[PDB]
Coordinates of C-alpha atoms in Angstrom, one line a residue:
Chain A
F665 CA -24.1 -34.9 -9.2
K666 CA -21.1 -36.4 -7.2
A667 CA -19.9 -34.1 -4.4
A668 CA -16.9 -31.8 -5.3
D669 CA -14.1 -31.8 -2.7
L670 CA -15.2 -28.5 -1.0
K671 CA -14.8 -29.7 2.6
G672 CA -11.6 -28.4 4.4
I673 CA -9.8 -25.3 5.3
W674 CA -9.1 -22.8 2.5
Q675 CA -6.6 -19.8 2.4
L676 CA -7.5 -16.7 0.5
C677 CA -4.9 -15.7 -2.2
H678 CA -4.3 -12.5 -4.1
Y679 CA -2.2 -11.7 -7.2
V680 CA 0.8 -9.3 -7.0
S681 CA 2.4 -7.6 -10.0
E682 CA 4.9 -5.0 -10.9
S683 CA 2.6 -3.4 -13.5
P684 CA -1.2 -3.0 -13.8
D685 CA -1.2 -4.8 -17.2
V686 CA 0.9 -7.9 -16.3
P687 CA -1.0 -10.8 -14.6
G688 CA 0.2 -11.2 -11.0
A689 CA 1.8 -14.0 -9.2
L690 CA -0.4 -15.9 -6.7
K691 CA 0.3 -15.1 -3.0
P692 CA -1.5 -16.6 0.0
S693 CA -3.0 -14.1 2.4
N694 CA -4.6 -13.7 5.9
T695 CA -8.1 -15.0 5.5
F696 CA -9.4 -18.6 5.9
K697 CA -12.7 -20.3 5.0
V698 CA -13.6 -23.4 7.1
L699 CA -16.1 -25.6 5.2
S700 CA -16.9 -28.3 7.7
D701 CA -18.1 -31.9 7.1
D702 CA -21.5 -31.0 8.7
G703 CA -22.3 -28.1 6.3
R704 CA -21.1 -25.1 8.3
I705 CA -19.1 -22.2 6.9
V706 CA -16.9 -19.8 8.9
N707 CA -14.7 -17.1 7.4
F708 CA -12.0 -15.6 9.6
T709 CA -9.0 -13.2 9.2
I710 CA -5.8 -13.3 11.1
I711 CA -4.4 -9.9 12.2
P712 CA -0.6 -10.4 12.7
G713 CA 0.3 -9.8 16.4
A714 CA -3.4 -9.3 17.4
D715 CA -6.5 -11.4 17.8
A716 CA -7.9 -13.1 14.6
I717 CA -11.5 -12.2 13.9
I718 CA -14.5 -14.2 12.6
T719 CA -15.8 -12.1 9.6
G720 CA -18.7 -14.4 8.5
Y721 CA -20.6 -17.6 9.3
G722 CA -23.5 -19.7 8.4
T723 CA -24.2 -23.0 6.5
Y724 CA -23.3 -24.1 3.0
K725 CA -24.4 -26.7 0.4
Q726 CA -23.3 -27.6 -3.1
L727 CA -26.2 -27.0 -5.6
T728 CA -24.6 -28.1 -8.9
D729 CA -21.3 -29.3 -10.4
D730 CA -20.1 -25.7 -10.5
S731 CA -22.2 -23.8 -7.8
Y732 CA -22.6 -23.8 -4.0
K733 CA -24.7 -21.8 -1.7
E734 CA -23.6 -20.0 1.5
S735 CA -26.6 -19.3 3.7
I736 CA -25.0 -16.4 5.7
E737 CA -26.2 -15.6 9.2
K738 CA -23.9 -12.6 9.7
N739 CA -21.1 -11.2 7.6
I740 CA -19.2 -8.1 8.9
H741 CA -17.1 -8.0 5.7
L742 CA -20.2 -7.9 3.4
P743 CA -23.2 -6.9 5.6
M744 CA -25.7 -6.9 2.6
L745 CA -25.4 -10.8 2.7
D746 CA -26.8 -11.0 6.3
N747 CA -29.7 -13.5 6.5
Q748 CA -29.3 -14.1 2.7
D749 CA -28.2 -16.9 0.4
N750 CA -25.1 -16.1 -1.7
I751 CA -24.7 -18.4 -4.7
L752 CA -21.0 -18.9 -5.5
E753 CA -20.0 -20.2 -8.9
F754 CA -16.9 -22.3 -8.4
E755 CA -14.2 -24.5 -10.0
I756 CA -11.6 -26.5 -8.1
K757 CA -8.4 -26.5 -10.4
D758 CA -5.8 -29.2 -9.8
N759 CA -7.5 -30.3 -6.5
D760 CA -5.9 -27.4 -4.6
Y761 CA -7.3 -24.1 -6.0
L762 CA -10.9 -23.0 -5.4
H763 CA -11.8 -20.2 -7.9
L764 CA -15.1 -18.6 -7.0
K765 CA -17.3 -15.8 -8.2
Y766 CA -20.4 -14.2 -6.8
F767 CA -22.6 -11.3 -7.7
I768 CA -23.8 -8.5 -5.3
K769 CA -26.8 -6.5 -6.7
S770 CA -26.9 -3.6 -4.1
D771 CA -24.6 -2.4 -1.3
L772 CA -25.2 -1.8 2.4
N773 CA -26.4 1.8 1.6
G774 CA -29.1 0.5 -0.9
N775 CA -27.3 1.8 -4.0
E776 CA -27.2 -0.2 -7.3
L777 CA -23.8 -2.1 -7.4
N778 CA -24.2 -5.0 -10.0
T779 CA -20.7 -6.2 -9.4
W780 CA -19.1 -9.6 -9.8
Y781 CA -16.5 -10.5 -7.0
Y782 CA -13.7 -13.0 -7.8
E783 CA -11.7 -15.0 -5.2
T784 CA -9.0 -17.6 -5.4
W785 CA -8.5 -19.8 -2.3
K786 CA -5.8 -22.6 -1.8
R787 CA -6.5 -25.8 0.1
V788 CA -4.6 -25.8 3.4
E789 CA -2.8 -29.2 3.7
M790 CA -0.5 -31.1 6.1
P791 CA 3.1 -31.1 4.7
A792 CA 5.4 -34.2 5.1
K793 CA 7.5 -32.6 7.9
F794 CA 7.0 -29.9 10.5
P795 CA 9.3 -27.0 9.4
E796 CA 12.2 -25.9 11.6
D797 CA 12.3 -22.3 13.0
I798 CA 8.5 -21.7 12.8
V799 CA 6.7 -19.5 15.4
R800 CA 3.5 -21.4 16.5
Chain B
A1279 CA 13.2 19.0 -6.0
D1280 CA 11.9 17.3 -2.8
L1281 CA 13.7 14.0 -3.3
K1282 CA 15.1 13.7 0.3
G1283 CA 13.1 11.3 2.5
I1284 CA 11.9 7.8 2.8
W1285 CA 10.0 6.4 -0.2
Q1286 CA 7.8 3.2 -0.3
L1287 CA 7.6 1.1 -3.5
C1288 CA 4.1 0.6 -4.8
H1289 CA 2.9 -2.6 -6.7
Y1290 CA -0.4 -3.8 -8.2
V1291 CA -2.6 -6.2 -6.2
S1292 CA -5.6 -8.0 -7.7
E1293 CA -8.2 -10.6 -6.6
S1294 CA -7.9 -12.5 -9.9
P1295 CA -5.1 -12.9 -12.5
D1296 CA -7.5 -11.4 -15.2
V1297 CA -8.6 -8.2 -13.3
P1298 CA -6.1 -5.3 -13.5
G1299 CA -4.5 -4.7 -10.0
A1300 CA -5.0 -1.7 -7.9
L1301 CA -1.9 0.4 -6.9
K1302 CA -0.9 -0.4 -3.3
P1303 CA 2.1 0.3 -1.1
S1304 CA 4.5 -2.6 -0.8
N1305 CA 7.5 -4.0 1.1
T1306 CA 10.4 -2.0 -0.3
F1307 CA 11.8 1.4 0.9
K1308 CA 14.3 3.8 -0.6
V1309 CA 16.0 6.1 1.9
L1310 CA 17.4 9.2 0.1
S1311 CA 19.3 10.8 2.9
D1312 CA 20.1 14.5 3.5
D1313 CA 23.8 13.8 3.0
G1314 CA 23.5 12.2 -0.5
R1315 CA 23.3 8.5 0.4
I1316 CA 20.8 6.1 -1.1
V1317 CA 19.7 2.8 0.5
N1318 CA 17.1 0.4 -0.9
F1319 CA 15.8 -2.2 1.6
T1320 CA 12.9 -4.8 1.6
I1321 CA 11.0 -6.1 4.6
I1322 CA 10.4 -9.9 4.5
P1323 CA 7.3 -10.9 6.6
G1324 CA 8.3 -13.3 9.4
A1325 CA 12.1 -12.8 8.8
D1326 CA 14.8 -10.2 8.7
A1327 CA 14.4 -7.2 6.4
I1328 CA 17.3 -7.0 3.8
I1329 CA 19.4 -4.2 2.3
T1330 CA 19.2 -4.7 -1.5
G1331 CA 21.2 -1.8 -2.8
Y1332 CA 23.2 1.2 -1.7
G1333 CA 25.4 4.1 -2.9
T1334 CA 25.2 7.8 -3.3
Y1335 CA 22.8 10.0 -5.3
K1336 CA 22.5 13.6 -6.7
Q1337 CA 19.9 15.4 -8.6
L1338 CA 21.2 16.4 -12.1
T1339 CA 18.2 18.4 -13.7
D1340 CA 14.6 19.3 -12.9
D1341 CA 13.5 15.7 -14.0
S1342 CA 16.6 13.5 -13.5
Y1343 CA 18.8 12.2 -10.7
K1344 CA 21.8 9.8 -10.6
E1345 CA 22.3 6.8 -8.3
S1346 CA 26.0 5.9 -8.1
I1347 CA 25.4 2.3 -7.0
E1348 CA 28.2 0.6 -5.0
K1349 CA 26.3 -2.8 -4.7
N1350 CA 22.8 -3.9 -5.7
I1351 CA 21.7 -7.6 -5.1
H1352 CA 18.4 -7.0 -6.8
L1353 CA 20.0 -5.6 -10.1
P1354 CA 23.8 -6.8 -10.0
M1355 CA 24.4 -5.2 -13.4
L1356 CA 24.2 -1.7 -11.7
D1357 CA 27.2 -2.5 -9.3
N1358 CA 29.8 0.2 -9.5
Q1359 CA 27.7 2.1 -12.2
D1360 CA 25.8 5.3 -12.4
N1361 CA 22.1 4.8 -13.1
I1362 CA 20.4 7.9 -14.5
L1363 CA 16.8 7.9 -13.3
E1364 CA 14.2 10.2 -15.1
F1365 CA 11.7 11.3 -12.4
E1366 CA 8.6 13.3 -11.7
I1367 CA 7.1 14.0 -8.2
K1368 CA 3.3 14.2 -8.7
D1369 CA 1.2 15.9 -6.0
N1370 CA 4.3 16.1 -3.6
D1371 CA 3.7 12.4 -2.7
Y1372 CA 4.3 10.1 -5.7
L1373 CA 7.8 9.6 -7.2
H1374 CA 7.4 8.2 -10.7
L1375 CA 10.7 7.0 -12.0
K1376 CA 12.1 5.4 -15.2
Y1377 CA 15.5 4.0 -16.0
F1378 CA 17.1 1.9 -18.7
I1379 CA 19.2 -1.3 -18.3
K1380 CA 21.2 -2.1 -21.5
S1381 CA 22.4 -5.6 -20.6
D1382 CA 21.6 -8.4 -18.0
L1383 CA 24.2 -10.0 -15.5
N1384 CA 25.4 -12.4 -18.3
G1385 CA 26.1 -9.5 -20.8
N1386 CA 23.1 -10.3 -23.1
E1387 CA 21.3 -7.4 -24.7
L1388 CA 18.2 -6.4 -22.6
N1389 CA 17.4 -2.8 -23.7
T1390 CA 14.6 -2.5 -21.2
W1391 CA 13.0 0.5 -19.6
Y1392 CA 11.9 -0.1 -15.9
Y1393 CA 9.1 2.0 -14.4
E1394 CA 8.5 2.5 -10.7
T1395 CA 6.1 4.4 -8.5
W1396 CA 7.1 5.2 -4.9
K1397 CA 5.0 7.0 -2.3
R1398 CA 6.5 9.4 0.3
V1399 CA 6.5 8.0 3.8
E1400 CA 5.1 10.7 6.2
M1401 CA 4.4 11.3 9.8
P1402 CA 0.6 11.4 10.3
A1403 CA -1.0 13.7 12.9
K1404 CA -1.7 10.8 15.4
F1405 CA -0.2 7.4 16.0
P1406 CA -3.0 4.9 14.9
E1407 CA -4.5 2.5 17.4
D1408 CA -4.2 -1.3 17.0
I1409 CA -1.0 -1.4 14.8
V1410 CA 1.8 -3.9 15.5
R1411 CA 5.2 -2.1 16.0
Chain C
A504 CA 30.3 1.6 18.4
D505 CA 28.8 1.0 15.0
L506 CA 25.4 2.7 15.7
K507 CA 25.1 4.0 12.1
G508 CA 22.7 1.9 10.0
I509 CA 19.2 0.6 9.6
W510 CA 17.9 -1.2 12.7
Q511 CA 14.8 -3.5 12.9
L512 CA 12.7 -3.7 16.1
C513 CA 12.5 -7.1 17.6
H514 CA 10.5 -8.9 20.3
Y515 CA 11.6 -11.7 22.6
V516 CA 9.2 -14.5 22.1
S517 CA 8.7 -17.9 23.9
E518 CA 6.1 -20.5 23.9
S519 CA 6.1 -20.8 27.7
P520 CA 7.0 -18.3 30.5
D521 CA 9.6 -20.8 31.7
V522 CA 11.5 -21.7 28.5
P523 CA 14.2 -19.2 27.2
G524 CA 12.9 -17.3 24.2
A525 CA 14.2 -16.0 20.9
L526 CA 14.4 -12.6 19.3
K527 CA 12.0 -12.2 16.4
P528 CA 12.0 -9.2 13.9
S529 CA 9.0 -6.9 13.7
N530 CA 7.6 -3.9 11.6
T531 CA 9.5 -0.9 12.9
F532 CA 12.8 0.5 11.7
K533 CA 15.2 3.1 13.1
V534 CA 17.4 4.8 10.6
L535 CA 20.6 6.2 12.3
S536 CA 22.2 8.1 9.4
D537 CA 25.8 8.9 8.8
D538 CA 25.1 12.7 9.3
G539 CA 23.6 12.3 12.8
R540 CA 19.8 12.1 11.9
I541 CA 17.4 9.6 13.5
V542 CA 14.1 8.5 12.0
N543 CA 11.8 5.9 13.4
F544 CA 9.1 4.4 11.0
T545 CA 6.6 1.5 11.1
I546 CA 5.3 -0.5 8.2
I547 CA 1.5 -1.1 8.2
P548 CA 0.8 -4.2 5.9
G549 CA -1.5 -3.2 3.0
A550 CA -1.3 0.5 3.8
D551 CA 1.2 3.3 3.9
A552 CA 4.2 3.0 6.3
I553 CA 4.4 5.9 8.8
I554 CA 7.2 8.0 10.2
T555 CA 6.6 7.9 14.1
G556 CA 9.6 9.9 15.3
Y557 CA 12.6 12.0 14.2
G558 CA 15.4 14.2 15.3
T559 CA 19.2 14.0 15.6
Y560 CA 21.4 11.7 17.6
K561 CA 24.9 11.6 19.0
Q562 CA 27.0 9.0 20.9
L563 CA 27.9 10.3 24.4
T564 CA 29.9 7.4 25.9
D565 CA 30.9 3.8 25.1
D566 CA 27.4 2.7 26.4
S567 CA 25.1 5.7 25.9
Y568 CA 23.8 7.8 23.1
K569 CA 21.4 10.8 22.9
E570 CA 18.3 11.2 20.6
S571 CA 17.3 14.9 20.4
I572 CA 13.7 14.2 19.4
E573 CA 11.9 16.9 17.5
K574 CA 8.5 15.1 17.3
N575 CA 7.5 11.5 18.3
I576 CA 3.8 10.4 17.8
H577 CA 4.5 7.1 19.5
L578 CA 5.9 8.7 22.6
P579 CA 4.8 12.4 22.7
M580 CA 6.4 13.1 26.1
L581 CA 9.8 13.0 24.2
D582 CA 8.9 16.0 21.9
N583 CA 11.6 18.7 22.0
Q584 CA 13.5 16.6 24.6
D585 CA 16.8 14.8 24.7
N586 CA 16.4 11.1 25.5
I587 CA 19.6 9.4 26.8
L588 CA 19.6 5.8 25.8
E589 CA 21.9 3.3 27.5
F590 CA 22.9 0.7 24.9
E591 CA 24.9 -2.4 24.3
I592 CA 25.5 -4.0 20.8
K593 CA 25.7 -7.8 21.4
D594 CA 27.5 -9.9 18.7
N595 CA 27.6 -6.8 16.3
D596 CA 23.9 -7.4 15.3
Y597 CA 21.6 -6.7 18.3
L598 CA 21.2 -3.3 19.8
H599 CA 19.8 -3.6 23.4
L600 CA 18.6 -0.2 24.6
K601 CA 17.1 1.2 27.8
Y602 CA 15.9 4.7 28.7
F603 CA 14.2 6.3 31.7
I604 CA 11.1 8.6 31.5
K605 CA 10.8 10.7 34.8
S606 CA 7.3 12.2 34.1
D607 CA 4.2 11.8 31.8
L608 CA 2.7 14.6 29.6
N609 CA 0.7 15.9 32.6
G610 CA 3.8 16.3 34.8
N611 CA 2.9 13.3 37.1
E612 CA 5.8 11.1 38.4
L613 CA 6.3 8.1 36.2
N614 CA 9.9 6.9 37.0
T615 CA 9.8 4.1 34.5
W616 CA 12.6 2.3 32.6
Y617 CA 11.7 1.4 28.9
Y618 CA 13.6 -1.5 27.1
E619 CA 14.0 -2.2 23.4
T620 CA 15.9 -4.7 21.2
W621 CA 16.8 -3.9 17.6
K622 CA 18.6 -6.1 14.9
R623 CA 21.0 -4.6 12.3
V624 CA 19.6 -4.8 8.8
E625 CA 22.2 -6.2 6.4
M626 CA 22.7 -7.0 2.7
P627 CA 22.7 -10.8 2.3
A628 CA 25.0 -12.5 -0.3
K629 CA 22.1 -13.0 -2.7
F630 CA 18.6 -11.6 -3.4
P631 CA 16.2 -14.4 -2.3
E632 CA 13.8 -15.9 -4.9
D633 CA 10.0 -15.6 -4.5
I634 CA 9.9 -12.5 -2.2
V635 CA 7.4 -9.7 -2.9
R636 CA 9.2 -6.3 -3.3
Chain D
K778 CA -26.4 -27.0 39.4
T779 CA -25.8 -25.2 36.0
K780 CA -23.7 -27.6 33.7
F781 CA -25.9 -26.7 30.6
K782 CA -24.5 -23.0 31.1
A783 CA -20.8 -24.3 30.8
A784 CA -18.5 -22.6 28.3
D785 CA -18.4 -24.4 24.8
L786 CA -15.3 -26.2 23.6
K787 CA -16.7 -25.9 20.0
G788 CA -15.2 -23.0 18.0
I789 CA -12.0 -21.6 16.6
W790 CA -9.2 -21.2 19.1
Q791 CA -6.0 -19.1 18.7
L792 CA -2.8 -20.3 20.5
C793 CA -1.2 -17.7 22.8
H794 CA 2.5 -17.3 23.4
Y795 CA 4.7 -14.9 25.5
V796 CA 6.1 -11.7 24.0
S797 CA 8.2 -8.9 25.3
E798 CA 10.2 -6.0 24.2
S799 CA 13.4 -7.6 25.7
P800 CA 14.8 -10.8 27.1
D801 CA 15.2 -8.9 30.5
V802 CA 11.4 -8.3 30.6
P803 CA 9.0 -11.3 31.2
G804 CA 6.7 -11.9 28.2
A805 CA 3.1 -10.9 28.2
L806 CA 0.5 -13.3 26.9
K807 CA -0.4 -12.5 23.2
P808 CA -2.2 -14.3 20.4
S809 CA 0.0 -16.2 18.0
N810 CA -0.1 -18.0 14.6
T811 CA -1.7 -21.4 15.4
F812 CA -5.4 -22.2 15.4
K813 CA -7.4 -25.2 16.7
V814 CA -10.7 -25.8 15.0
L815 CA -13.0 -27.8 17.3
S816 CA -16.0 -28.4 14.9
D817 CA -19.6 -28.9 15.9
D818 CA -19.4 -32.5 14.3
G819 CA -16.5 -33.7 16.5
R820 CA -13.5 -32.9 14.2
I821 CA -10.2 -31.3 15.4
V822 CA -7.7 -29.6 13.1
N823 CA -4.6 -27.7 14.3
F824 CA -3.0 -25.4 11.7
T825 CA -0.3 -22.7 11.7
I826 CA -0.1 -19.7 9.4
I827 CA 3.4 -19.0 8.0
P828 CA 4.0 -15.3 7.1
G829 CA 4.4 -14.9 3.3
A830 CA 3.7 -18.6 2.6
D831 CA 1.0 -21.3 2.7
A832 CA -0.5 -22.0 6.2
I833 CA 0.0 -25.7 7.2
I834 CA -2.2 -28.3 8.9
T835 CA -0.1 -29.7 11.8
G836 CA -2.5 -32.1 13.4
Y837 CA -6.0 -33.6 12.9
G838 CA -8.5 -36.1 14.1
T839 CA -11.6 -36.3 16.1
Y840 CA -12.4 -35.1 19.6
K841 CA -15.0 -35.7 22.4
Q842 CA -15.6 -34.1 25.8
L843 CA -15.3 -36.8 28.5
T844 CA -16.0 -34.9 31.7
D845 CA -16.6 -31.3 33.0
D846 CA -12.8 -30.7 32.8
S847 CA -11.4 -33.2 30.2
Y848 CA -11.7 -33.9 26.6
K849 CA -10.0 -36.5 24.3
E850 CA -8.3 -35.8 20.9
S851 CA -8.2 -39.1 18.9
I852 CA -5.3 -37.9 16.7
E853 CA -4.8 -39.4 13.2
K854 CA -1.6 -37.6 12.4
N855 CA 0.3 -34.8 14.2
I856 CA 3.6 -33.5 12.7
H857 CA 4.2 -31.2 15.7
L858 CA 3.9 -34.2 18.2
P859 CA 4.4 -37.4 16.1
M860 CA 4.2 -39.7 19.3
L861 CA 0.4 -38.9 19.3
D862 CA -0.2 -40.4 15.8
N863 CA -3.1 -43.0 16.0
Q864 CA -3.4 -42.3 19.8
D865 CA -5.9 -40.7 22.1
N866 CA -4.5 -37.7 23.9
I867 CA -6.5 -36.8 27.1
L868 CA -6.5 -33.0 27.6
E869 CA -7.4 -31.6 31.0
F870 CA -9.1 -28.2 30.4
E871 CA -10.7 -25.2 31.9
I872 CA -12.4 -22.3 30.0
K873 CA -11.8 -19.1 32.1
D874 CA -14.2 -16.1 31.5
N875 CA -15.7 -17.8 28.4
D876 CA -12.7 -16.8 26.2
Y877 CA -9.5 -18.6 27.4
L878 CA -9.0 -22.3 27.1
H879 CA -6.3 -23.5 29.5
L880 CA -5.2 -27.0 28.7
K881 CA -2.7 -29.6 29.9
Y882 CA -1.7 -33.0 28.7
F883 CA 1.0 -35.6 29.5
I884 CA 3.5 -37.2 27.2
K885 CA 5.1 -40.4 28.7
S886 CA 7.7 -41.0 25.9
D887 CA 8.8 -39.5 22.5
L888 CA 8.9 -41.6 19.2
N889 CA 12.5 -42.7 20.1
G890 CA 11.4 -44.2 23.5
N891 CA 13.2 -41.5 25.5
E892 CA 11.2 -41.5 28.8
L893 CA 9.9 -37.9 28.9
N894 CA 7.2 -37.8 31.7
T895 CA 6.3 -34.3 30.9
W896 CA 3.2 -32.2 31.3
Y897 CA 2.6 -29.7 28.5
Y898 CA 0.5 -26.5 29.2
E899 CA -1.3 -24.4 26.6
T900 CA -3.5 -21.3 26.6
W901 CA -5.8 -20.6 23.6
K902 CA -8.2 -17.6 23.1
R903 CA -11.6 -18.0 21.5
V904 CA -11.7 -16.3 18.0
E905 CA -14.9 -14.1 17.8
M906 CA -16.7 -11.8 15.5
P907 CA -16.3 -8.2 16.6
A908 CA -19.1 -5.6 16.2
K909 CA -17.5 -3.9 13.2
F910 CA -15.0 -4.9 10.5
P911 CA -11.9 -2.9 11.1
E912 CA -10.8 -0.4 8.3
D913 CA -7.0 -0.8 7.8
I914 CA -6.9 -4.6 7.6
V915 CA -5.4 -7.0 5.0
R916 CA -7.7 -9.8 4.0

């Protein structure tokens, strides 16, 4: 296969809605995934007005056209992935949205979970101009 | 009925557009004062919060109250009108409301029921550590 | 002075200790009602907002008002006390306050001035597009 | 002679700014909205989170440590400081207590040719993994 455009900085998004039945509108959130050029992965979450925190790190590698592996060293968000390979099924839609899914068999307590997790991330890009009235 | 207080609008948050969202507290507040005033306002992250509606209110029956709206920038068709809201407070903490809007701002037939869930804002026993005031 | 309203806590922020800063709105609100009630509350993103203090208030002079605090989880030393706040409203929108606490909860001498800056929450001309309520 | 024990530049750094409760009170150093990613493979990316909107990349390029107290950013594009586009910026630095990156750099002139001759100072804090994931946090 030819490498998908995974490398970059990705921003976690969620879907907000007025009813539980209507599909939500996409909104960018506080978590970032840095997929480096040398195969390193770092997840971190900003805490407004406080220190941001690293929540997971390791290495990554694309396996197929629609799957990549994160070889997680430590993950405080999902401790069951520590020293494990997590296979993420993915699709990049319109060059900017990374739609991923992964499966967790058992939780940190050892109980059967058998749950698929879904995430949407948006590629962080440089705009044409630096916006006025922004707090760096 | 225990309507007086500060209420926080809830919305539905999901990880995917296909998975049903979980009910979560959101950015909008309804202040139902002890002296019969109503104010709706919405916080805007990184900017000034905004008042979106105000007027007076009064409970009419066991399951209905009236908001006599002066101005409402969220729903301009309610300006200078009485809105009758059907309500139920479940478990002392959740205000479930429904109201009907006949027409939109242009006068076109809407005939839509709006449903809202608000959660009572309370004082907890202790001030939590590591929150940004 | 026009004390009545909803006030939003601000911080003064600069990129350097030498460059003059700017006021930036935060997560805390003070509701100074028309009937003399005061409520402080803080939004916690993704969780329930919390009431952190309440009581009554009354203007005393042109540049001072009193908060008769019943309970305050943020500042417990003000419980069942009158706090006299020196204030100035600059350009109708910014409430600059200062108050003095003589002693801590243990009765030890504190003799400390506390400063706060709040911005008046207003209704804008139009409801902005693409905000999350 | 312990230069191998020197603090790493590599990592994710968070820009600090000065915040107080009032303009009459001097601001305390606090973490802000801007991040510098100094990768293991010599890439630099500056980006700023914008509450309620998409975060934005504000500068990128490559970097390399030159001496014990200086490193170079070979900037491709920088929307925050456009005069650094396609230039090398030499940053004098010191890492204090492993966690604070104190840097300074000099800008001779702006894009318009206005002689500036100004030193810029920045403080960044190393972003780390805490022992436990905190409970009431928004991802």
